Amino acid sequence: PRRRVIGQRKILPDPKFGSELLAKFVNILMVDGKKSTAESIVYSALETLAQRSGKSELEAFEVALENVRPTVEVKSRRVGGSTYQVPVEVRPVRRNALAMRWIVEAARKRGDKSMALRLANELSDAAENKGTAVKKREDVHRMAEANKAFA
Amino acid sequence: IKVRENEPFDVALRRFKRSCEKAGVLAEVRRREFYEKPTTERKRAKASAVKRHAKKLARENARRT
């Protein structure tokens, strides 16, 4: 705000398989604090995909992650006379922030029959750059090109 | 005004414009005669010249810098 820049906490490694990045998927999927249900659905997803694709477990969050890789977006500099968009350099935390956010926009919509149903598919869908997740970054890109070659 | 920095500018790099008289000067002789607001304005303009001049040399106390 106008004062001290706050920081972070001690985010717990996953008590199934120690890992922090995916722990925010819980956070970026949590609704009304239903952890066990998330523990039910979030878990259901990865192991079946690990089982379905054939690779390791913690390289499944990665396989999808390749083609959903974002780098930038817009953060407009509307000084008060120029609301022209200005693209932003999406920093790591800022990067992974919208990252686990793209798993949201993709999965929450077009509810087939179950969360783990779509989530697992979207992962490997994201792994071949032909699904919702991967383009979720692409769409962002085409509203940034608007302005090029600035100083 | 005339910028064509051989080949590799490829961007604005139009300081040649902004440094001399870019439209701000057009936006200086815009629309009004007065004859005199500037007559008065130059006097007040220069007024700042000496006082701000003092600010650099009248800042010479301790002030715990």
Partner: protein, 65 residues
């Protein structure tokens, strides 16, 4: 801030066009004595000699014709 003529005593001609061009910017505009920090009496010899050059088109009034 060239200590030009406070120690360079002579009359400023327009014929020395090489020396003359050193006082006009690329956009034609003649540059003030403030930046060059030389004497106005001496700088006075400049502007009139400029128009002499300007009148003969030896230099430009303003390049965009």
């Amino acid at each position: 801030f060239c200590r030009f003529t406070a120690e360079g005593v002579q009359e400023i001609d327009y014929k020395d066009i090489a020396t003359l061009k050193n006082y006009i910017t690329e956009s034609g505009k003649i540059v003030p004595s403030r930046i060059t920090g030389t004497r106005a009496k001496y700088q006075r010899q400049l502007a009139r000699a400029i128009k002499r050059a300007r009148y003969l088109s030896l230099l430009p009034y303003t390049d965009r014709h």
